[PDB]
């Protein structure tokens, strides 16, 4: 078809994934702005195609202010376009590095939004499998800005608490122990990634890190992190308590999104 080129005018660069070029675009008939995730289909196997339609299907199922909305999904002979609502505040990643870290108040507020979005996924039978700051976008651009959960390229359907081997996918520093152990996993993997994110928000570097990737995974599997002084000296014990529950190596013992949104540090305000 030619539905996209006819109805949209492509504009500027916004961001890139491992296989995606995302660009701003304007719906010609309305002058409304959107984000066009463009993907070369000539390069893709039948599996990657099924992943692409899977992403589209999951995005549609999810309707929430803190989840990116899908406006349209168009196929052309050599490219596929996923037209999302534009979000112009940039990646949460960009903001953390610009500010080094967030105050406990900004962190709490930010992680609350993240948790509300992933909780929505879980209650709707979705596990994202790829929570990280570069997949979290800011609405306003600067300060109090609403966070929007994006990138469902690896999301899949799970129902309840049951865990199965859904394959080896995600992002190294954010991967949970049970995935790295090649054990059956489920929704709880997203909370691990959140714990990693919260830790990043509070001091601006990840809790699991190593030059050698094999060692990094070792660290993640053993839940080997700490709170080095002086960075964590001023940080409240309750803030740390929330992280500890999220970075619980055993997923059945791991805090859920729901019972993380209750946590004092999040809710004692």
């Amino acid at each position: 078809c030619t539905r996209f080129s006819d109805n949209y005018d492509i504009k500027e660069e916004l961001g890139k994934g491992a296989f995606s070029i995302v660009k701003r675009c304007v719906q010609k008939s309305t002058g409304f702005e959107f984000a066009a995730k463009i993907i070369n289909t000539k390069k893709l196997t039948a599996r990657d195609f099924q992943k692409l339609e899977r992403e589209a299907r999951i995005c549609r199922k999810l309707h929430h202010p803190n989840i990116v909305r899908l406006h349209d999904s168009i196929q052309e002979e050599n490219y596929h376009y996923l037209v999302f609502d534009l979000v112009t505040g940039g990646e949460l990643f960009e903001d953390i590095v610009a500010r080094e870290f967030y105050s406990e108040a900004d962190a709490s507020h930010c992680i609350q939004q993240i948790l509300e979005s992933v909780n929505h996924c879980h209650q709707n039978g979705v596990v994202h499998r790829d929570l990280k700051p570069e997949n979290l976008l800011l609405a306003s651009k600067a300060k109090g800005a609403a966070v929007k959960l994006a990138d469902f390229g690896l999301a899949i359907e799970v129902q309840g608490d049951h865990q199965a081997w859904f394959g080896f996918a995600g992002t190294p520093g954010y991967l949970s122990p049970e995935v790295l152990k090649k054990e059956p996993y489920g929704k709880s993997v997203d909370i691990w990634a959140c714990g990693v994110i919260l830790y990043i928000l509070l001091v601006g570097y990840p809790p699991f890190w190593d030059e050698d990737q094999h060692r990094l995974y070792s660290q993640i599997k053993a839940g080997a992190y700490d709170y080095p002084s002086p960075e964590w000296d001023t940080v409240t014990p309750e803030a740390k308590n929330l992280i500890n529950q999220m970075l619980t190596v055993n997923p059945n013992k791991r805090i859920t999104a729901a019972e993380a949104l209750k946590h004092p540090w999040i809710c004692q305000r």
Partner: peptide
Amino acid sequence: QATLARQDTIDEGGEVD
């Protein structure tokens, strides 16, 4: 030391039913 950096996504598959 640890530095917050962009990490690329991976999917090596291997899903078993």
